[PDB]
Design an enzyme around this catalytic site. Sequence first.
Site, PDB file in Angstrom:
ATOM      1  N   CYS A   1      61.228  65.143   4.858  1.00 22.47           N
ATOM      2  CA  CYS A   1      60.078  65.421   4.590  1.00 22.47           C
ATOM      3  C   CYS A   1      59.891  67.102   3.897  1.00 22.47           C
ATOM      4  O   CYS A   1      60.823  67.915   3.977  1.00 22.47           O
ATOM      5  CB  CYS A   1      59.234  65.470   5.724  1.00 22.47           C
ATOM      6  SG  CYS A   1      59.016  67.058   6.754  1.00 22.47           S
TER       7      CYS A   1
ATOM      8  N   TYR B   1      37.562  48.805  22.988  1.00 20.24           N
ATOM      9  CA  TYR B   1      38.648  49.484  23.652  1.00 20.24           C
ATOM     10  C   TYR B   1      38.279  51.121  23.594  1.00 20.24           C
ATOM     11  O   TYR B   1      38.340  51.628  24.748  1.00 20.24           O
ATOM     12  CB  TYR B   1      40.198  49.614  22.926  1.00 20.24           C
ATOM     13  CG  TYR B   1      40.967  50.607  23.582  1.00 20.24           C
ATOM     14  CD1 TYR B   1      41.163  51.916  22.986  1.00 20.24           C
ATOM     15  CD2 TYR B   1      42.049  50.103  24.582  1.00 20.24           C
ATOM     16  CE1 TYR B   1      42.163  52.656  23.715  1.00 20.24           C
ATOM     17  CE2 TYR B   1      42.846  51.024  25.245  1.00 20.24           C
ATOM     18  CZ  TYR B   1      42.953  52.228  24.637  1.00 20.24           C
ATOM     19  OH  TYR B   1      43.853  53.296  25.286  1.00 20.24           O
TER      20      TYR B   1
ATOM     21  N   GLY C   1      36.512  48.391  18.370  1.00 20.98           N
ATOM     22  CA  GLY C   1      35.546  49.287  19.018  1.00 20.98           C
ATOM     23  C   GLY C   1      35.450  49.421  20.345  1.00 20.98           C
ATOM     24  O   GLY C   1      35.001  50.411  20.896  1.00 20.98           O
TER      25      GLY C   1
ATOM     26  N   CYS D   1      60.773  70.085   6.271  1.00 23.43           N
ATOM     27  CA  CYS D   1      61.850  70.327   6.443  1.00 23.43           C
ATOM     28  C   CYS D   1      62.830  70.836   5.363  1.00 23.43           C
ATOM     29  O   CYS D   1      63.769  71.463   5.673  1.00 23.43           O
ATOM     30  CB  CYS D   1      62.547  69.272   7.268  1.00 23.43           C
ATOM     31  SG  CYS D   1      61.877  68.704   8.641  1.00 23.43           S
TER      32      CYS D   1
ATOM     33  N   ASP E   1      39.956  49.246  14.219  1.00 30.19           N
ATOM     34  CA  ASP E   1      39.809  48.558  15.479  1.00 30.19           C
ATOM     35  C   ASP E   1      38.209  47.930  15.746  1.00 30.19           C
ATOM     36  O   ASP E   1      37.498  48.317  15.002  1.00 30.19           O
ATOM     37  CB  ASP E   1      40.285  49.229  16.566  1.00 30.19           C
ATOM     38  CG  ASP E   1      40.751  48.601  18.148  1.00 30.19           C
ATOM     39  OD1 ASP E   1      40.647  47.430  18.049  1.00 30.19           O
ATOM     40  OD2 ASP E   1      41.073  49.421  18.866  1.00 30.19           O
TER      41      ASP E   1
ATOM     42  N   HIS F   1      55.225  66.867   9.465  1.00 28.70           N
ATOM     43  CA  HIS F   1      56.518  65.988   9.707  1.00 28.70           C
ATOM     44  C   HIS F   1      56.513  65.104  10.786  1.00 28.70           C
ATOM     45  O   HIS F   1      57.465  64.106  10.371  1.00 28.70           O
ATOM     46  CB  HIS F   1      57.319  67.396  10.542  1.00 28.70           C
ATOM     47  CG  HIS F   1      58.608  66.821  11.218  1.00 28.70           C
ATOM     48  ND1 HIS F   1      59.799  66.725  10.639  1.00 28.70           N
ATOM     49  CD2 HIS F   1      58.695  66.720  12.315  1.00 28.70           C
ATOM     50  CE1 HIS F   1      60.490  66.194  11.378  1.00 28.70           C
ATOM     51  NE2 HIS F   1      59.827  66.095  12.807  1.00 28.70           N
TER      52      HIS F   1
HETATM   53  C1  LIG Z   1      47.151  53.837  23.443  1.00 29.59           C
HETATM   54  N1  LIG Z   1      47.212  52.545  23.838  1.00 29.59           N
HETATM   55  C2  LIG Z   1      46.321  51.525  23.519  1.00 29.59           C
HETATM   56  N2  LIG Z   1      46.461  50.277  24.116  1.00 29.59           N
HETATM   57  C3  LIG Z   1      45.581  49.486  23.402  1.00 29.59           C
HETATM   58  C4  LIG Z   1      45.071  48.156  23.654  1.00 29.59           C
HETATM   59  C5  LIG Z   1      44.059  47.686  23.037  1.00 29.59           C
HETATM   60  C6  LIG Z   1      43.647  46.378  23.193  1.00 29.59           C
HETATM   61  O1  LIG Z   1      43.902  45.714  24.020  1.00 29.59           O
HETATM   62  N3  LIG Z   1      42.399  45.905  22.395  1.00 29.59           N
HETATM   63  C7  LIG Z   1      42.011  46.773  21.292  1.00 29.59           C
HETATM   64  N4  LIG Z   1      40.932  46.181  20.478  1.00 29.59           N
HETATM   65  N5  LIG Z   1      42.440  48.040  20.916  1.00 29.59           N
HETATM   66  C8  LIG Z   1      43.365  48.357  21.780  1.00 29.59           C
HETATM   67  C9  LIG Z   1      43.782  49.811  21.389  1.00 29.59           C
HETATM   68  C10 LIG Z   1      43.467  50.710  20.377  1.00 29.59           C
HETATM   69  C11 LIG Z   1      44.180  50.593  18.952  1.00 29.59           C
HETATM   70  C12 LIG Z   1      43.344  51.332  17.994  1.00 29.59           C
HETATM   71  C13 LIG Z   1      42.394  52.340  18.005  1.00 29.59           C
HETATM   72  C14 LIG Z   1      42.008  52.785  16.938  1.00 29.59           C
HETATM   73  C15 LIG Z   1      42.393  52.554  15.681  1.00 29.59           C
HETATM   74  C16 LIG Z   1      43.061  51.336  15.443  1.00 29.59           C
HETATM   75  C17 LIG Z   1      43.600  50.670  16.558  1.00 29.59           C
HETATM   76  C18 LIG Z   1      45.094  50.358  22.093  1.00 29.59           C
HETATM   77  N6  LIG Z   1      45.399  51.700  22.514  1.00 29.59           N
HETATM   78 ZN   LIG Z   2      60.621  66.872   8.360  1.00 31.31          ZN
END
Ligand SMILES: CNc1nc2cc3c(=O)[nH]c(N)nc3c(CCc3ccccc3)c2[nH]1
Ligand SMILES: [Zn+2]
EC number: 2.4.2.29
Lengths: 359, 359
Positions: free
Chosen positions: B296, B86, B84, B299, B82, B325
């Site tokens: 897996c 978010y 960074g 299990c 990602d 799992h």
């Molecule tokens: C749990 N909900 C959630 N909604 C998201 C919306 C966004 C968004 O609108 N923009 C960006 N850039 N990232 C998002 C992420 C993080 C995903 C991620 C984090 C770490 C590694 C790999 C991928 C989100 N995660």
């Molecule tokens: Zn399993």
Amino acid sequence: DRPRFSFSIAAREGKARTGTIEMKRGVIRTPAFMPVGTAATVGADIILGNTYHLMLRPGAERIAKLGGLHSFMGWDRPILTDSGGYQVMSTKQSEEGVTFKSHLDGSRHMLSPERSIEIQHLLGSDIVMAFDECTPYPATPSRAASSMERSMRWAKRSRDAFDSRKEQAENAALFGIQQGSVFENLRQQSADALAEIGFDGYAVGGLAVGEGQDEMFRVLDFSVPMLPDDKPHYLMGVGKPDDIVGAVERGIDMFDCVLPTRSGRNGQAFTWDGPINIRNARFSEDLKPLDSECHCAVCQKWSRAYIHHLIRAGEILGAMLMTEHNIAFYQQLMQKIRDSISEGRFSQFAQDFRARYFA
Amino acid sequence: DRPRFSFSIAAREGKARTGTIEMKRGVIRTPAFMPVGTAATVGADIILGNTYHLMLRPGAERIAKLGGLHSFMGWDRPILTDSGGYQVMSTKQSEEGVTFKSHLDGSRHMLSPERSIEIQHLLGSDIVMAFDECTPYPATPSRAASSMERSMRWAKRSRDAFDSRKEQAENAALFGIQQGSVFENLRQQSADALAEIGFDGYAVGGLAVGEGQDEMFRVLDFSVPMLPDDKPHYLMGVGKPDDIVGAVERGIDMFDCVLPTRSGRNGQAFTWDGPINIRNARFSEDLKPLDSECHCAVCQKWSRAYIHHLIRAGEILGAMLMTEHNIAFYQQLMQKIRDSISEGRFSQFAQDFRARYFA
Ligand SMILES: CNc1nc2cc3c(=O)[nH]c(N)nc3c(CCc3ccccc3)c2[nH]1
Ligand SMILES: [Zn+2]
Ligand SMILES: CNc1nc2cc3c(=O)[nH]c(N)nc3c(CCc3ccccc3)c2[nH]1
Ligand SMILES: [Zn+2]
């Protein structure tokens, strides 16, 4: 079909021995290290069950209902269980046994020789420890003698309880535990009492309770020769790699220790160059594996830097990789010990080991 | 030699697609679930790096010095990172980027489109996310529009930064991220802006931020058709098994979620009959595996009762077996999804899945 219990010594060097214990569920190569079975997906020939914990959660009768520890833990090879009193003391004591209350639900529990053997039977262990009293250190001669004398009465009660249970008597083995603190005369009386009762193996109890390595070795120097030579010798609670080497030099065949399990979660990794604390910043860019010679899967694939990173990040994977390495290191240590005794070069191995381990 | 990036659709059913992404380091089967790479010894075709954490510990320049994430983590297949922002927002914002201070050592850090791309380059990831602003939920139309508009300017800056780095442009791929909150007109403007820039794949951002499944699906119903059909569609942050099935029905190809990783450490196991909390006392004598159909290794070997016991005892092994799992369950889910689309029976699969999962 393997026997219930047979110990064979294949080679000797000084007081050190290497050989095999044959049991119905498998062969145990000695000198042996016996890891905690819940430590990881566990190569070890035998694992430990934690009687004291298992009494309290889920209870021995529940383990038996689930088919016994072998089925429960998915391990079809031998299992050794302790008798539970050492753990309980780590309470009201009497000649009958010990009473104590569970911190987890308040239930009261009694432990006696008879109940300890029955619990270990319900757990289904292959090597059963007699119910003893681990004497605190330091102990005066009088208290050590009184405690040892009680343990020897409990050892006879343990023997009789074990022999009364046909499935246990025919399929498991029973070890007696020597006590007597650091006192030669009491160790001798204890050995004499245990041998008169007769056991399948003999443990050296009452050590690894704070006395330090010099004193432990001093007690082993005179205590292990008191035990029957033709039966296995188990040093309870030992220990660090250098403790193991020195104990093998003094005639010990079997070992258990929390170090590899506990050490791994706290960041300590064992190597031929001594222990390291992988959380230390000096490992943040170290691309070497945890140990340069280790054949374990962790050292085949990942660096000190990565394991450092995982542990510092609080990732469970980091602790599991550390634990896997530590268990594998200990088994490699035991294999090098066995090979060196069988090749008649254990003395040189021990000297070389210590020079590098303490450098 | 595989291409830098090629997406091929092999079969369709309604809006659902199954196919493959070919990249230099490997082939990714879609629909794909992408687990966190530090979760366990990870079958997944691609794993996630955690840019935000890696910036802070050990730092992107240090990861590059250690040879990049592939070497660091021992994973030679594709990695997605990602951008960074978010994570940073989960701070002073401006048209340039975001400034923030590290809780771990107080150091100040700036994140901009240009710096985000450079960090992801230093990490060595194969799929690079554009630097965006994840709009908070709920958002008014004006704030959602202003935020989306800024993200689209940052997407163009991300594109240019990526293209300037030859090794990155020639060996990695860049995904644009659609924003616009829950508003159809803004989602359309965002899609239009991203397609005019041109990316290798398109993510649906700004969801899984508290809106609930009904609203998420409502936004996906009109948002995914706005994206180029011939490129992969990645729904960021999703999700639970039922979220994944419904998102695939709406044209999503790629998924990430913390549930399997987080759930495993907190005691939650995914099964075809829904999630269970293995710490619950109802599992203390349950000899069935975590899931009756799961292939897996957990299990195959161990019971609910044993995993319950390990977690209740605080043993690290219990969390690792739960995590293993859960990751395996998710991959089995994705394989059944892919097979059912390729066999033209995904609609029936989804109906059957939901009937059992919510029973
Ligand atoms: C749990 N909900 C959630 N909604 C998201 C919306 C966004 C968004 O609108 N923009 C960006 N850039 N990232 C998002 C992420 C993080 C995903 C991620 C984090 C770490 C590694 C790999 C991928 C989100 N995660
Ligand atoms: Zn399993
Ligand atoms: C760390 N030091 C340590 N010294 C010990 C002395 C004794 C002793 O004198 N009597 C008994 N019965 N046990 C001892 C133990 C516990 C060993 C154990 C626990 C759990 C599983 C398997 C084996 C000890 N441990
Ligand atoms: Zn190793």
